[PDB]
């Protein structure tokens, strides 16, 4: 299978500097072109560079050029993305692609992508707290910044019955909630914990569903 | 740059039926490529050069046209096709991709299973009362909520967050969350949550 991993997504000021990491493997990473694609928060797509096999050749849309340089390492199969001069509208999840010998020019291979933030707000680790009265459970996830977080229940095994509520952002935070929907006889009889990871703030947090 | 205009915004159909969304070009494509997006994942490739279907995408679906229009077709709709279209060429530099069509599916009216729930203890102690209300699987998707503390309607503080529609019963959800203080909330005892497409209504008491 090919696989695409982006990292070094993240939080960064207006006028700053961030730097994107691809790692590619399942294909001879050094006969493909690459390109990243960004997807805002309008949930608009642009391509925003593209490279060669051996890194010669590079190209970018007017709104980026100057600010980001797209390179590549043949060795560690890693592509990268250096954003300079970043403005507000670089707010976007960043993809890495990979195309086609084939020509034609779709994208062939998507990453699960990396958000990049550009704002002057801090980063701040959510508090989490249990929402206790089939029955439904939540988890409460306030004041976090910036995006994203992951909120599973009992390792993934009730994921079924989850629904995951967009983060609204309020006084410079965000805060979003997610639900679980269990059988009566399921909870309270079992425990039932919701596991909010915040990869900005290299936090996770537990918190055991019990009726108040 | 080629312009992608695609059709309609939205495309709402039910289950069983034939629909066709449309992706026009400002000037001539030789190929035109497509990608199915579902909320919380990557476009995924769905149709490659005009007509093929990339591994794993249904028969149902097809792709034709040529020039400057091209269109993705579904012969009989499921609810699993809930999702962003999004059409996207590259026969000129640079590439460019359509705003995309949504396709939501019709079903049966369903009520909200409505859950209200009290600030955790931590909460209040740190001087917070967020009281949040689930509407959970609902259809349509227009749905009102409105909040009442000791019977009287609250509108300050009421912030609504809605899902996209469940590519497997077809539903949406939506959650309303009451940001009171900790100080505010305790001048009061009876919460509720409301919600109409006669109502569904929720309740607590502080007190209990
Ligand atoms: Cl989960």
């Known amino acids: 299978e090919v696989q695409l991993v982006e990292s070094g997504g993240g939080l960064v000021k207006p006028g700053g500097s961030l730097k994107l990491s691809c790692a590619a493997s399942?294909?001879?990473?050094?006969?493909?072109?690459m390109y990243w694609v960004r997807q805002t928060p309008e949930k608009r797509l642009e391509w925003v560079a593209t490279?060669?096999?051996?890194?010669?050749?590079?190209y970018y849309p007017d709104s980026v050029k100057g600010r980001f340089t797209i390179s590549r390492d043949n060795a560690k199969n890693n592509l990268y993305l250096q954003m300079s001069s970043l403005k507000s509208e670089d707010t976007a999840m960043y993809f890495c692609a990979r195309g086609s010998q084939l020509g034609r020019g779709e994208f062939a291979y998507w990453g699960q992508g990396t958000l990049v933030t550009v704002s002057a707000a801090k980063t701040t680790p959510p508090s989490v707290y249990p929402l206790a009265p089939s029955v439904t459970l939540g988890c409460l996830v306030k004041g976090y910044f910036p995006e994203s977080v992951t909120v599973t229940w009992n390792s993934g095994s009730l994921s079924s019955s989850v629904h995951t509520f967009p983060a609204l952002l309020q006084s410079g935070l965000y805060t979003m909630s997610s639900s679980v929907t269990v059988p009566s006889s399921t909870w309270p009889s079992q425990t039932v914990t919701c596991s909010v990871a915040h990869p900005a703030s290299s936090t996770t947090v537990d918190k055991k569903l019990e009726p108040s | 740059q080629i312009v992608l205009s695609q059709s309609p915004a939205i495309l709402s159909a039910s289950p069983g039926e034939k629909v066709t969304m449309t992706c026009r070009a400002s000037?001539?494509?030789?190929?035109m490529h497509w990608y199915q997006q579902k909320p919380g994942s990557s476009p995924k490739p769905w149709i490659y050069?005009?007509?093929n279907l990339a591994s794993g995408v249904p028969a149902r679906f097809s792709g034709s046209g040529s020039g400057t229009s091209y269109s993705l077709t579904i012969s009989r709709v499921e609810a699993e096709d809930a999702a962003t279209y999004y059409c996207?060429?590259?026969?000129?530099?640079?590439?460019?991709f359509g705003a995309g069509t949504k396709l939501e599916l019709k079903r049966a009216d369903a009520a909200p299973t409505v859950s209200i729930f009290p600030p955790s203890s931590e909460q209040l102690t740190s001087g917070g009362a967020s009281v949040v209300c689930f509407l959970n699987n609902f259809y349509p998707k227009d749905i009102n909520v409105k909040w009442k503390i000791d019977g009287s309607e609250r509108q300050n503080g009421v912030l609504n967050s809605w899902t996209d529609q469940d590519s497997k019963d077809s539903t949406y959800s939506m959650s309303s969350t009451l940001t009171l203080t900790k100080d505010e909330y305790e001048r009061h005892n009876s919460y509720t949550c409301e919600a109409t497409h006669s109502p569904i209504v929720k309740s607590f008491n502080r007190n209990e």
């Open positions: 996207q060429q590259w026969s000129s530099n640079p590439p460019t």
């Open positions: 399942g294909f001879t990473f050094s006969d493909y072109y």
């Open positions: 050069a005009t007509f």
């Open positions: 490279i060669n096999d051996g890194g010669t050749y590079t």
């Open positions: 000037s001539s494509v030789s190929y």
